[PDB]
Symmetry: none
Subunit: 38 residues, 4 copies
């Protein structure tokens, strides 16, 4: 195989897994307004 | 062709397609506020 | 010359170009709210 | 020794360092609304 190209391929699926992983968050519009305007 | 590079290339145009398509996700700012505040 | 791997390199400087191209300006709070509440 | 893949390899970890580096940048709902609505 080739750990050099494979390594990079993982760096890509990394930025992706990071985006969708953080998206599954339900977040909250009330927590942002009451926590932002204190 | 070489599925390793060809694949990674696609994984790139993917993270991109996901960035812009996710940006258009937002649309009705009035509904979102009527879904969280209520 | 290898347009396949080279093409990818450009796809990278692309995702970067975009991110910063929008940072310069693309929010507009008075426009998204006056046109968001419809 | 392959300067073509190695080169992009650095451009990739760059988009990453620049992505997370820009993320640590916090903000404020009262600052963007008092500076944007003005």
């Amino acid at each position: 195989s080739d750990p050099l190209v494979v390594a990079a391929n993982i760096i890509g699926i990394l930025h992706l897994i990071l985006w969708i992983l953080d998206r599954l968050f339900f977040k909250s519009i009330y927590r942002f307004f009451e926590h932002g305007l204190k």
